[PDB]
Design brief:
Chain G: Produces ATP from ADP in the presence of a proton gradient across the membrane. The alpha chain is a regulatory subunit. Chain G: This is ATP synthase subunit alpha. Chain G: Belongs to the ATPase alpha/beta chains family. Chain G: It is found in: Cell membrane; Membrane. Chain G: It comes from Bacillus sp. (strain PS3). This is part of a larger assembly, with three copies of chain A, three copies of chain B and one copy of chain C (175 residues). Chain A is an alpha/beta fold and 500 residues long. Chain A is built from 17 helices and 18 strands. In chain A, helix 11 crosses helix 13. In chain B, helix 10 crosses helix 11 and helix 10 crosses helix 13. Chain B contains 14 helices and 17 strands. Chain B has 471 residues and is an alpha/beta fold. Chain C is an alpha+beta fold and 175 residues long. Chain C has eight helices and four strands, in the order H-H-H-H-H-H-E-H-E-E-E-H. In chain C, strands 2-1-3-4 form a four-stranded mixed beta sheet, covered by helices on one side. In chain C, helix 2 runs antiparallel to helix 6. Classes of the chains: A alpha/beta (500), B alpha/beta (471), C alpha+beta (175). At the A-D interface, strand 1, helix 4 and helix 6 of A face strand 4 and helix 7 of D. Strand 4 of chain A pairs antiparallel with strand 1 of chain B. The complex binds adenosine-5'-triphosphate (ATP), adenosine-5'-diphosphate and magnesium ion (2 copies). Adenosine-5'-diphosphate sits at the interface of chains B and A. Adenosine-5'-triphosphate (ATP) sits at the interface of chains A and D.
Chain lengths: 500, 471, 175, 469, 144, 118, 71
């Protein structure tokens, strides 16, 4: 039953001046160090959640303000912190430097520049833990978040302000879907933020380079917490991403924040809680592993018009194990978000990329977010895929009745060939509308399966030089053009297209 | 003139030390109002409630908001009572916080209003009322196989993303308008989005000015997510005690009550129980759950969504709440993945009101014959999985042939799910779903395709949808 | 677990007694306090009683221990506030154990069948003080007659048995 | 002064107390050297790694050898740095343990050699490589179907009896031949007789004069086996940073690393997480495998055998390694019994690199067509079994007659197998193996017999083996 | 640790005293609620190893129409035979025999071969036993 | 008391002849070995126990000892009245510490039956 | 066979340390003949008993337990 503050020289300096009054200090000395978690006697004017600075220069967050010691969590490399180092308190509660001058930089969860392009001149700080927008602070999601992926923008559409989980196994294309929906925001007024949690530094470097190639760093901010970084920096990367997005949200700008593998944050918080000897629960995650992600993702709102109208749309990622959507962390994050995009593994092995299982991918709030043309076009798209998948699940061989022989199977094969994309090439929404129109109305029933991709590739170049009236109509009025002219345009391309 | 210091601050949990003989009590509210003397301090307006006594004049508390900013040695003002909540018909048409304060931006409740404490003992045995009457909902699984009791507690067990918020919103859409008595929606620990959609639906559908709303949604630290169910409950207890009024009380995710208890219980000095839950998992949800009762003065008919973590019905937080509920509807992930909405397991769902002296003999034997054919098909599942349909002995083929029709005809299109799919939704009376299931079991609809029965209100619409398919 | 927590307190009091330079006035006073607390045991049950406030217990120590030294009084008033007054005689005994390492003196217990004269006691004390490294050596004799015409000496944890150990080793080496 | 004193000894865990303000930092090394002054005491040479700080000026360490004989009160010397391991040219050809001491009987490394610390932060974001370059191994089935990356992590799922060590020796030979790259082997917790077998095979091969080995084998305490991959990796980092060259780094059975850290954490008294793993599973694996990257000056690529406990890929010890893997090369026993060397399974070996942006368009189309023809031929096995070889069709008979040529063409003559079969062996570049599989898939080399395609380097010299027969 | 001792300390108190002690008895009926029908849980295997037999109630038999839901094949009585009257014993013997026979022969009747008449008579007998052993709610029957 | 030592044991395996044909043929009993009965009720476990006691005390002259360690006071009383009825009780010694007793008694009942047999 | 074999016995009635020390006594009796040049065959009957006795020793000495309480 030993208490940690029972240190011999410390007891000696306590019976230095017991009854004689001693003015209390705002510095403290470390008692214990280990596993990125320290304790310090002293610091009685510290407050809960304050940034404290070690003599090394490493920051720290004071979690537990116990009776004679302060439980400090070391935010950085802790191998230079010894017992006896003095801890100095700053006076701020978990602030990251946030500004307009942070756009295009790659930072750690404490707002320090990691890419090595010099300092970041910001004048304003934002707290990491802050209350979410309340029930009267919000507004219903009505603005489209255009990803440029046809399967997302048609089947599971994202609104500006909703939280949609992107879920799937390892090597199923979650990061590519993120970088595609970040590269597509170049024309829009979206400020993207990519938060990489527990990834390899090599892949984060290639991610940042493919963002720099497509001009995406004019609006995106990369918050990097590596796999080699300690769990206190992994735990704070999404909160730093949200705190950097809220500056632009509460000024009226629209922010997209992407969390690559929140399962890594949950595992690092399991680490940070078990090293604090908090008793674990199901799958050894702590009791507040739900509250870990709910304090994060409920802070992503569509604000009302009384508060400026800004929005934080969040795309968190959860990595399953063998396609298990009924695990503990996937079902914790499903019941926080407004939908899921289930990137299935064997559809990714068979070649369907993006490999969206459209049966299990739902968008709750989306559907009021489609652009009034994608509604008309995709409402007859979704059931073709649904019927096609659950009848190719059994009808592999044997002759079938002519409806279920061709008008289901061949139409579904044309849907699958329509919805495939190559990565880092986002399609604008009007060309998605016209291709899925030419699919669903029946203009791809003549063209064989192997030519749908080249039909789409040449049809886009056809549209860019002839159908500017169609594309400008879908830009301005957001509705489908009059179907006589549009059928005339598609038949005018089918007269030109050379079938192979 | 007795105040107390702060000794320890441990996340949600604060230690407070008073003078000798002036400890408040358990469950009293403690206030902190600090004024940020210098630039190294933060303004604090924080309320604490007492959970324990520890000896040496110390008090183990649970905070109701975020403790980020508390300094050791900060003074605490005692109140001398639990968290007192403004109550009455002042609460009708307003949205509230955990502390009783209004959040709906329409003004503040005056200080001279009547305030009831959150914590009180349960109603006694001599005061309770046990008359069983059926509440008609218009949902075919609920009306046939697990009827709801007008004045008893009701559960909506589901996993994550399986259909219990849609089911609770359609029960509001089918019940709360024509109810003729006070509603209370206390949302415990669900999406703050769904507190906004639901409030604007109450505004434009004109339900509100009879509904009091209490939101302690999932952004709140767990001290709020515990006591939110109790402040919504004391708002409803005013009506059924003082006014004798029939009360609806919808609680969304009463699981989050026990989860928020589990988050604080490690820091309260308690040992962990099995599965990481607090030791008092059965009595913290017995002191809440025995105050939602229909007494002799008035009746509370309460429908409670209950989350089931990791789709594990053997978890101690859903398993110890089956013993509190009169009617349950156990949603299943498999039925939602087959497209059967509501995803109600027809066999795991039970009720006190499915008995012939209450529900009628024709209703009772049609419900039991439906359950019998679905259980026989559930026994045949393995033979159908491995050997296929071709081995069954011409009565089992008929049982499968009828049970596909039954488990698809239990699915129904909702008014809430009009925004999902465009199909406008249906309301089905009890005698008509009894007649439709009797006509399915008689064999009157064996010639129709089995996909003609999905998402259909009554069986004339089965006939219409099968004609539109082209049979 | 109790002895190491007593050792921490005793080492802190030893460091403040070596730093303040008032070592004898600390040592004799802690010896007197250890004797007084070994005399009566009801004082711990008096100070463990909950209805007495902490100021009343502090005034009770300040009245009952009014003649003690100031670092000893500060140490015991810190021990009272930590609910560690049930740990004070062990830390007093370990403080007197640790102060003799500063003086260099060791305490030895000699079991002899006959009471030895003081000249042989001083001779063996000087001899095993030169052997063990002490400046002087304190010898405590006993009147236990079970030894076979000899003396066995205990230097801390290392003993010098030469009284019946000869016959014991003889009957051990014979068989 | 930095002299210490032992307080507690309990198994490997040793608590050492210093004076105040003279504490050792975490991960430092502590030399305990004791000459026994009498017949009671025992001579001790023993190194400790600082792991925690307990307060009361004490330090909890984990041990690198056996703690038998450690006395409460004996002297401990603080080194002032973590475990310093010799690097340079003096490590090539030498067998080492975790402390950087030579296991061999050849000699000792002098004290004036360069020794660099064992624990180092990973190379920063500023210093990495922006692009993804290909690592050209000269094996055809590797360079065509599961290509490697400079700075990659590759998984071997072979086991014994499939020629895992033959691939290891040939990758060392080919990279040190063409790329000028030193290799480093690191056997994290492996059988000692298999370590000696591997050393004698690499001595007979002649590959060793270019590699360096580290064996902290199974008999050593868990504090040794947790730090063995780090002292293979510190030897690789000298040739990455100071020399600037493409270095291999073989970690045999990194599951032994994960469970060595698990039992270290169980000895240290931490609360165990999911599946019995140390709470710090993903961050210990990250502190290993984020130093295996390609920087601007050189690279370290890594080939890592993986245990796959109770053969599920969802156990946390395979799952936190598979999030760092860039490629897998499955070795199958039925391809070694067929006569195809190496025994790399062409359909189960996958790669993240095999994509047209990284590798190229022609390589990608040829590789995917090879996988399609071998998949069709693997489907046709039961049809050949029940219908016989004839009467299938013309098309799938052409598929079998094409795909068995492709399947036997995937075998090479290694430089390693020259002392076994007498054939000189070949390094096949990636452009010539893409051209060779393209010319097989066109049908240009269809008329040649299939035993000319076995054990042949490239496509220009299958004509001579068809000419000799 | 003492949860078995908790249940056994009260369940051993339910006794039948001898004629010296008065002859008065105390029979008990403890209940244990399983979780998805795992007999192999901790508290069920502690209470099963105290009581003098058990009556397994199953939902598979509750929804197939057999109310009361007794799995009489797995349900054990440890007195049984010394409890019953002579008239119940004489006929409960052959009822247990042909219900066990029907539980064995129902295994080979869900698909396939459409068994011969020599055990089809036993299957019809057993279906009539199952139909006899059903009751309503709160209708107890005397012994006669 | 400690177990018997290494040189005190019997060097050969000898067979405890029971007189029961299933036991004598298909699962013989070591004279000095440890046997497992896996049976509930209705299987005549008490009748098998009684004929073991009767045949051993008839043909070998061997006393038996029943040590009932924490199992069902009702079955213990049934077994004692069947000892009295069989008439083989005058050969056995019975020790009962049942489920009703604290776990110290259930710990030491097997050992006091053992020290009565020794 | 007792012209060349050695039998080392830690039966179940002995305490857990003798059960723990039986196999190390086995190799310590075998390595003498191994480093003299002979060939030795050491047979460890049920090492699981030895692991369970070391589990008992580590648990009664208050050491932190791992999986199945093995240290
Ligand atoms: N639409 C696409 N077309 C072609 N290739 C694609 C497409 N989408 C993704 N890929 C490829 O799939 C590979 C893996 O995808 P990605 O790494 O984004 O998935 P991930 O879930 O992030 O993997 P990990 O979690 O292991 O990092 C990438 O190399 C990428 O090139
Ligand atoms: N009656 C229904 N008809 C169609 N879809 C439904 C129905 N009920 C639920 N769903 C779908 O299932 C999901 C259930 O989500 P919801 O019940 O709101 O979350 P939770 O169950 O976690 O509270 C919704 O996304 C909705 O798309
Ligand atoms: Mg990714
Ligand atoms: Mg919900």
């Amino acid at each position: 039953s030993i208490r940690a503050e029972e240190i011999s020289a410390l007891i000696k300096q306590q019976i230095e001046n017991y009854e004689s009054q001693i003015q209390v200090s705002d510095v403290g000395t470390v008692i214990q160090v280990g596993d990125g978690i320290a304790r310090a006697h002293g610091l009685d004017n510290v407050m809960s959640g304050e940034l404290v600075e070690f003599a090394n220069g490493v920051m720290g967050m004071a979690l537990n303000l116990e009776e004679n010691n302060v439980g400090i969590v070391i935010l950085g490399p802790y191998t230079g912190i010894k017992e006896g180092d003095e801890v100095r308190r700053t006076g701020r509660i978990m602030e990251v430097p946030v500004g307009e001058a942070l756009i295009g930089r790659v930072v750690n969860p404490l707002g320090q520049p990691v890419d090595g392009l010099g300092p970041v001149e910001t004048t304003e700080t934002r707290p990491i833990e802050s209350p979410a927008p309340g029930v009267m602070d919000r507004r219903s999601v009505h603005e489209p978040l255009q990803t440029g992926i046809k399967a997302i923008d048609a089947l599971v559409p994202i609104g500006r302000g909703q939280r949609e989980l992107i879920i799937g196994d390892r090597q199923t294309g979650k990061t590519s879907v993120a970088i595609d929906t970040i590269i597509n925001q170049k024309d829009q007024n979206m400020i993207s933020i990519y938060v990489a949690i527990g990834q390899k530094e090599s892949t984060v470097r290639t991610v940042v380079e493919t963002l720099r190639k497509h001009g995406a760093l004019d609006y995106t901010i990369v918050v990097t917490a590596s796999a080699s970084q300690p769990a206190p920096l992994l735990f704070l990367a999404p909160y730093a991403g949200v705190a950097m997005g809220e500056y632009f949200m509460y000024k009226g700008k629209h922010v997209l924040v992407v969390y690559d593998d929140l399962s890594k944050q949950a595992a690092a918080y399991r680490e940070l809680s078990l090293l604090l000897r908090r008793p674990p629960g199901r799958e050894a995650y702590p009791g507040d592993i739900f509250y870990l992600h709910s304090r994060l993702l409920e802070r992503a709102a569509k604000l009302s018009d009384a508060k400026g109208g800004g929005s934080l749309t969040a795309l968190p990622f959860v990595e399953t194990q063998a396609g298990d959507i009924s695990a503990y962390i996937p079902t914790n994050v499903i019941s926080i978000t407004d939908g899921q995009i289930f990137l299935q593994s064997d559809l990714f092995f068979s070649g369907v990329r993006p490999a969206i299982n459209a049966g299990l991918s739902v968008s709750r709030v989306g559907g009021a977010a489609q652009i009034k043309a994608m509604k008309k076009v995709a409402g007859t798209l979704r059931l073709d895929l649904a019927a096609y998948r659950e009848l190719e699940a059994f009808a592999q061989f044997g002759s079938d009745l002519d409806k279920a022989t061709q008008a289901k199977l061949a139409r579904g094969a044309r849907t699958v060939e329509v919805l495939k994309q190559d990565l880092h090439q986002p399609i604008p929404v009007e060309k998605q509308v016209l291709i899925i129109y030419a699919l669903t109305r029946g203009f791809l029933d003549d063209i064989p399966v192997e030519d749908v991709r080249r039909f789409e590739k040449e049809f886009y170049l056809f549209l860019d030089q002839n159908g500017q009236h169609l594309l400008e109509h879908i830009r301005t009025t957001k509705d489908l053009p009059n179907e006589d002219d549009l059928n005339k345009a598609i038949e005018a391309f089918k007269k030109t297209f050379v079938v192979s | 003139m007795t105040r107390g210091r702060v000794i320890q601050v441990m996340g949600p949990v604060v230690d407070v030390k008073f003078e000798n003989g002036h400890l408040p009590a358990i469950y009293n509210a403690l206030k902190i109002q600090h004024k940020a003397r210098n630039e190294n301090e933060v303004d604090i307006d924080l309320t604490l409630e007492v959970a324990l006594h520890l000896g040496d004049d110390t008090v183990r508390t649970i905070a109701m908001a975020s403790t980020d900013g508390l300094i050791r040695g900060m003074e605490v003002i005692d109140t001398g009572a639990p968290i007192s909540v403004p109550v009455g018909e002042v609460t009708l048409g307003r949205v509230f916080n955990v502390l009783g304060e209004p959040i709906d931006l329409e003004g503040d409740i005056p200080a001279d209003a009547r305030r009831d404490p959150i914590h009180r003992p349960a109603p006694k045995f001599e005061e309770l009322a046990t008359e069983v009457e059926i509440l008609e909902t218009g949902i075919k699984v609920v009306d046939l196989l697990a009827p709801y009791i007008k004045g008893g507690k009701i559960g909506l067990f589901g996993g994550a993303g399986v259909g219990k918020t849609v089911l609770i919103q359609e029960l509001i859409h089918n019940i709360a308008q024509e109810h003729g008595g006070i509603s209370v929606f206390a949302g415990v620990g669900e999406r703050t989005r769904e507190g906004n959609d639901l409030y604007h639906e109450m505004k434009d559908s004109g339900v509100i000015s009879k509904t009091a709303m209490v939101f302690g949604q999932m952004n709140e630290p767990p001290g709020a997510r515990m006591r939110v169910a109790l402040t919504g409950l004391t708002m409803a207890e005013y009506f059924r005690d003082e006014q004798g009024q029939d009360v609806l009380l919808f609680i969304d995710n009463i699981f989050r009550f026990t989860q928020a208890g589990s988050e604080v219980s490690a820091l309260l000095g308690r040992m962990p129980s099995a599965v990481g839950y607090q030791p008092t998992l059965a009595t913290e949800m017995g002191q809440l759950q025995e105050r939602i009762t229909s007494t002799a003065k008035g009746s509370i008919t309460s429908i409670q969504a209950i989350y089931v973590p990791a789709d594990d019905y053997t978890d101690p937080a859903p398993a110890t709440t089956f013993s509190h509920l009169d009617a349950t509807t156990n949603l299943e992930r498999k039925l939602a993945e087959m497209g059967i909405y509501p995803a109600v397991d027809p066999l795991a769902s039970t009720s006190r009101a499915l008995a012939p002296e209450i529900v009628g003999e024709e209703h009772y034997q049609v419900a039991r014959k439906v359950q019998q054919t679905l259980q026989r098909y559930k026994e045949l599942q393995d033979i159908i999985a491995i050997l296929g349909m071709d081995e069954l002995s011409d009565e089992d083929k008929l049982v499968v042939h009828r049970a596909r029709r039954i488990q698809f005809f239990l699915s129904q299109n909702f008014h809430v799910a009009e925004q999902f799919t465009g199909q406008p939704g249906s309301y089905v009376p009890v005698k008509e779903t009894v007649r439709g299931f009797k006509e399915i079991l008689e064999g009157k609809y064996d010639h129709l395709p089995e996909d003609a029965f999905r998402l259909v209100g009554r069986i004339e619409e089965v006939v219409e949808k099968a004609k539109a398919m082209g049979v | 677990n109790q002895e190491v927590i007593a050792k921490r307190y005793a080492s802190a009091l030893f460091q403040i007694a070596l730093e303040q330079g008032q070592l004898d006035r600390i040592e004799e006073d802690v010896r007197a306090v250890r004797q007084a607390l070994a005399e009566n045991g009801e004082f711990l049950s008096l100070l463990s009683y909950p209805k007495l406030s902490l100021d009343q217990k502090k005034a009770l120590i300040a009245e009952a221990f009014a003649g003690v030294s100031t670092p000893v009084q500060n140490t015991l008033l810190l021990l009272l506030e930590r609910h560690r007054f049930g740990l004070v005689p062990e830390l007093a005994e370990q403080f007197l154990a640790l102060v003799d390492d500063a003086r260099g003196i060791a305490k030895a217990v000699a079991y002899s069948a006959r009471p030895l004269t003081d000249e042989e006691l001083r001779a063996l004390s000087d001899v095993f003080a030169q052997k063990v490294g002490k400046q002087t050596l304190e010898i405590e004799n006993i009147i236990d007659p079970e030894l076979i015409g000899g003396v066995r000496l205990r230097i801390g944890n290392r003993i010098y048995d030469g009284s019946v150990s000869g016959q014991l080793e003889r009957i051990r080496r014979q068989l």
